[PDB]
Amino acid sequence: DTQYIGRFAPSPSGELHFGSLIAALGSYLQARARQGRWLVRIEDIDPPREVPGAAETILRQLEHYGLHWDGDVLWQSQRHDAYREALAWLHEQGLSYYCTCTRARIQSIGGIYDGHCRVLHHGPDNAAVRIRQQHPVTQFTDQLRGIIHADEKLAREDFIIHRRDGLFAYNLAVVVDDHFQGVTEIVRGADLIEPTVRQISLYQLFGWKVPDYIHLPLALNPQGAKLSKQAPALPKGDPRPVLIAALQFLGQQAEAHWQDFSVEQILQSAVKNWRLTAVPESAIVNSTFS
Ligand SMILES: N[C@@H](CCC(=O)O)C(=O)O
């Protein structure tokens, strides 16, 4: 009954590239097709890996490509109190613990945590915070791909919520912020499929409503290899041929003679003609984007 709310949540570790344009465009078109809101959140939660100016570049790029968000941009750098608040609640509820294990130790036992500190009652001193999983989620529904079966060992891990170095974990921040922003459906890149079950486990532990999920096509280079595996910035010039290429990647109708249309017209038509079922599970990008 309530309005659809979707979002694009880029990390400012670089400017937009074709893969992140796919995520922005796919989430935008699905949100607009569903007559819903489309939010933008800057995930600037890791200062060291952030590039000064990149977040602003991204927002400017979105506008250049005709993708206008609703309301104000949320900045994770302004949400640290919210992550702290959620961690405090988990601790009071008996749903988290402090872990003093080294990376060397975890590597030596196969790379997946064994729950060593689960009942040792360490304090927060020089410790990471781990979630105390109860009933890990190992499968989820993707509205496009159907039921996904996750890697069981990774899915069942008491994963990190707050790193030893003090940074809040992505899995924590994304759940806290999507819930805070009232996100009802998460439409995002294929590279984010695996952590989905952990995020769902976390919604369940908070006692919050689990949103819907759509993972967009896996991007391949022309040789058929994963594109994400190690990317040219989006052209600063005419965005139209790039938008047309992105629509084609998403299996949508794409006007070959884009010269007689504005960016806004191309997008308006893309919303009207959006067919989620036409979005493929993988797609090959052209050489211009590899
Ligand atoms: N900033 C993260 C979050 C993605 C998401 O959950 O939509 C990324 O771009 O990889």
Ligand SMILES: [Zn+2]
């Ligand atoms: Zn430990």
